[PDB]
Amino acid sequence: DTRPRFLEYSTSECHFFNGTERVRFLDRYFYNQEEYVRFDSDVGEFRAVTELGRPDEEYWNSQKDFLEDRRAAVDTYCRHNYGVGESFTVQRRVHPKVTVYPSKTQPLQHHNLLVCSVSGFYPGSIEVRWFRNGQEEKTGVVSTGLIHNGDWTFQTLVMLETVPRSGEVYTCQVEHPSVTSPLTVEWRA
Amino acid sequence: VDRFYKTLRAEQASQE
Amino acid sequence: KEEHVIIQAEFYLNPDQSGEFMFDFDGDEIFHVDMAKKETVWRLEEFGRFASFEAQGALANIAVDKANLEIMTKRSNYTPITNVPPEVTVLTNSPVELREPNVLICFIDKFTPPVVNVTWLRNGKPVTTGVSETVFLPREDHLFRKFHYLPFLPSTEDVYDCRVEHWGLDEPLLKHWEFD
Numbered sequence: 612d613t614r615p616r617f618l619e620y621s622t623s624e625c626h627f628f629n630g631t632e633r634v635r636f637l638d639r640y641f642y643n644q645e646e647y648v649r650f651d652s653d654v655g656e657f658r659a660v661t662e663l664g665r666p667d668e669e670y671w672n673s674q675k676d677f678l679e680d681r682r683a684a685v686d687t688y689c690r691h692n693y694g695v696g697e698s699f700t701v702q703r704r705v706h707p708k709v710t711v712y713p714s715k716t717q718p719l720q721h722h723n724l725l726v727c728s729v730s731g732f733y734p735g736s737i738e739v740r741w742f743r744n745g746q747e748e749k750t751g752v753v754s755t756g757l758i759h760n761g762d763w764t765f766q767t768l769v770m771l772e773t774v775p776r777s778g779e780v781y782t783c784q785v786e787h788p789s790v791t792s793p794l795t796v797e798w799r800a
Numbered sequence: 801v802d803r804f805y806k807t808l809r810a811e812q813a814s815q816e
Numbered sequence: 817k818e819e820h821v822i823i824q825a826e827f828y829l830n831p832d833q834s835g836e837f838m839f840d841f842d843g844d845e846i847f848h849v850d851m852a853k854k855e856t857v858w859r860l861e862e863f864g865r866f867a868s869f870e871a872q873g874a875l876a877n878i879a880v881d882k883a884n885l886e887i888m889t890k891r892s893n894y895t896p897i898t899n900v901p902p903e904v905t906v907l908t909n910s911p912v913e914l915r916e917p918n919v920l921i922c923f924i925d926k927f928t929p930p931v932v933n934v935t936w937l938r939n940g941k942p943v944t945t946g947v948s949e950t951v952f953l954p955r956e957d958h959l960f961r962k963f964h965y966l967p968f969l970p971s972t973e974d975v976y977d978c979r980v981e982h983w984g985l986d987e988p989l990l991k992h993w994e995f996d
C-alpha cells in the first residue's frame with residue numbers, strides 16, 4: 612500500500628526496583644516516530660519531549676483530576692498490577708533443557724567447537740560454565756548471548772573452542788533460579 | 801481480593 | 817538496578833482505522849485485547865486462571881487514542897510516518913534433531929508503522945497448521961517487535977522460509993532455514 616499513514620502510539624511503563632520499594636512510572640506519547648510529551652513520576656508533572664508536545668504540557672498540567680490520577684499511578688496502577696501478576700510473571704520458573712553437541716569450524720581452524728545449548732527457560736538470568744576434567748575453562752568460551760524466544764522462554768548457545776585430546780571429559784554446567792543444584796551434561800570424544 | 805489488571809485511562813489531547 | 821518492567825502499549829493507525837492494546841512484562845506479552853471480538857486474549861492460558869482484565873477499558877482507551885491521532889495529525893501539519901523496514905531473524909526453539917518436534921521462530925524487529933504480512937513457506941508453499949504469533953510488542957524507542965511461530969517435524973527433504981511484507985521494504989523479505 613502506497614497511501615500515507617498516521618500513527619498515535621502510547622506506552623505506560625512501570626519500572627520496578629527492589630520488589631515494589633522503588634517504582635518509576637513513565638506515561639509516554641508518540642506521534643509517528645516522534646515522542647512528543649511524557650509524564651515522569653519522578654518529575655511529578657507532564658513535560659514536552661519536543662515542540663509538538665507543548666500544547667499538551669500546558670493543557671494536561673491544568674487538568675487537576677488527570678494530573679492527580681498520574682501522580683497516584685505508582686501505587687494505584689504500578690504496584691497494583693505487579694501484585695496481580697506476581698505468581699506467574701515475577702515468580703515464574705521454567706527449568707532448562709541442556710544439550711551438548713560437537714560443531715564444525717567455519718572454515719577449517721585449529722580448534723573445533725563444543726556447543727552447550729540451554730533452551731526453554733524462564734527467567735532470563737542464567738549461568739552457563741564450561742569444564743575440562745573438573746577445571747573451569749575461562750578462555751576460548753564464545754556465547755551468542757541471551758536469546759528471548761517471545762513465548763515466556765529464553766535460550767543461549769555457549770561454545771567452547773577446544774582440541775579433543777587425552778580422552779578428556781568436557782562438562783557444561785548450568786545454574787538457573789528454577790533449579791536447586793547446578794545441572795551438568797558430560798561429553799567425551 | 802482484586803485479581804484484575806487496571807487500565808491506565810487515556811485523556812483527550814489539547815485541541816489548541 | 818531495574819528488576820522488572822510492565823508496559824501497557826496501545827496504538828491507533830489511519831487510514832487503516834486499526835488499533836491495538838496490550839500488556840508487556842520484561843519483553844513478553846501478558847495479554848492483548850481482540851478489538852473485533854471485545855475479548856481479553858491471554859498469551860499463556862494459565863494467566864487467565866490467576867488474573868483477569870476488563871476488555872472495555874482497552875476499547876475506551878482506543879477511542880481516545882483515535883481522537884488524539886486526529887489532533888496530532890492536524891498539529892503536525894498532516895505529516896505522514898516515515899516507514900522503517902524490519903530486521904528479520906529466523907531460528908529454532910532448540911537444537912535440530914531429525915523426526916523430533918521443534919519450533920521455527922521468525923523474529924521481526926526495529927520497524928514502524930506496526931503493520932506486517934507474515935507467511936511461512938514450506939518448500940515455497942504456504943503453511944498455516946500450528947502457526948502462532950505475538951502482537952506488535954514494545955521497545956525502548958518508537959520501534960516495534962514481533963514473533964511468528966511454526967511447529968515442525970525436521971526433515972532433510974523439507975526447506976523453510978519466512979516471507980515478511982512491510983511498506984518500508986521494496987520487495988517482500990524472505991529469510992530461509994534448512995537442516996545442516
Ligand SMILES: *[C@@H]1O[C@H](CO)[C@@H](O[C@@H]2O[C@H](CO)[C@@H](O)[C@H](O)[C@H]2NC(C)=O)[C@H](O)[C@H]1NC(C)=O
Pocket residue numbers: 612613931932933981982983
Ligand atoms: C498485506 O496484504 C494485503 C493484501 O492481501 C495488502 O493490501 C494490498 O496492497 C496493494 C498495494 O500494492 C493493493 O493493490 C491492494 O488493493 C491491497 N489489498 C487489500 C485487500 O487491501 C497490504 O498492503 C499488505 N500489508 C503490508 C504491510 O505489506
Ligand SMILES: *[C@@H]1O[C@H](CO)[C@@H](O)[C@H](O)[C@H]1NC(C)=O
Pocket residue numbers: 629632
Ligand atoms: C530493599 O527494601 C528493604 C525495605 O525494608 C530494605 O531493607 C533493603 O535494604 C532494600 N534492598 C536494597 C538492595 O536496596
Ligand SMILES: *[C@@H]1O[C@H](CO)[C@@H](O)[C@H](O)[C@H]1NC(C)=O
Pocket residue numbers: 663891892893
Ligand atoms: C506547522 O505550520 C506552521 C506555520 O505557521 C508552523 O508554525 C509550524 O512550525 C508547523 N508545525 C510543525 C510540527 O512542523
Ligand code: NA
Pocket residue numbers: 736737738786787788
Ligand atoms: Na542464576
Ligand code: NA
Pocket residue numbers: 803864865866867868
Ligand atoms: Na482470576
Ligand code: NA
Pocket residue numbers: 804805806807868869870871
Ligand atoms: Na483488567
